[PDB]
Amino acid sequence: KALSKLSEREAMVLKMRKGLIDGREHTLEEVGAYFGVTRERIRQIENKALRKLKYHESRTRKLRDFLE
Amino acid sequence: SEELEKALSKLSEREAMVLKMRKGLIDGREHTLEEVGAYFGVTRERIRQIENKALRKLKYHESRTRKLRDFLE
DNA sequence: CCTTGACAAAG
DNA sequence: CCTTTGTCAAG
């Protein structure tokens, strides 16, 4: 399950969308096609992966941040 | 798939780290060339150079092997 | 591998 | 009005 960790697919969705795979940013449509899924599911997966990254210590790290 | 992440794995860690940071794959937040510069201790222009090389590597490999485009195109 | 200085845009 | 970002050309 994980509340702060990313699954193989979540990270891949991110790498493909942001251009980490071939230097080209890809549309939700293309990524969905790659995953035999809908462009909307990609968008969803994309969003959940980001929250896992934000929250992931980052959000709660803000108090320790004020001290650096 | 590690298979499609071939070129991305041949980038330097620094190069990879720069892309991840700029794009927000580290903490969900997109960072400025300046913030990344501050991270690695160099100017935003330098980071800009590094980022540019990294992408150039990815596009080049992609245009030579045609991994993703043989599928999309 | 790196920094400067001058800009356009956007804020 | 002044500042931040991302670019460029040189070195």
From Swiss-Prot, chain B:
Highest taxon, organism lineage: Bacteria
Disulphide linkage map: none
Compartment annotation: Cytoplasm
Annotated region (Sigma-70 factor domain-4), positions in chain: 7-59
DNA-binding region coordinates: 33-52
UniProt free text on domains: Contains 4 domains, connected by flexible linkers. In the active conformation, the domains are in an extended conformation, each making extensive interactions with the RNA polymerase catalytic core.
Quaternary data: Interacts transiently with the RNA polymerase catalytic core formed by RpoA, RpoB, RpoC and RpoZ (2 alpha, 1 beta, 1 beta' and 1 omega subunit) to form the RNA polymerase holoenzyme that can initiate transcription.
Function comment: Sigma factors are initiation factors that promote the attachment of RNA polymerase to specific initiation sites and are then released. This sigma factor is the primary sigma factor during exponential growth.
Similarity annotation: Belongs to the sigma-70 factor family. RpoD/SigA subfamily.
Protein name listed in UniProt: RNA polymerase sigma factor SigA
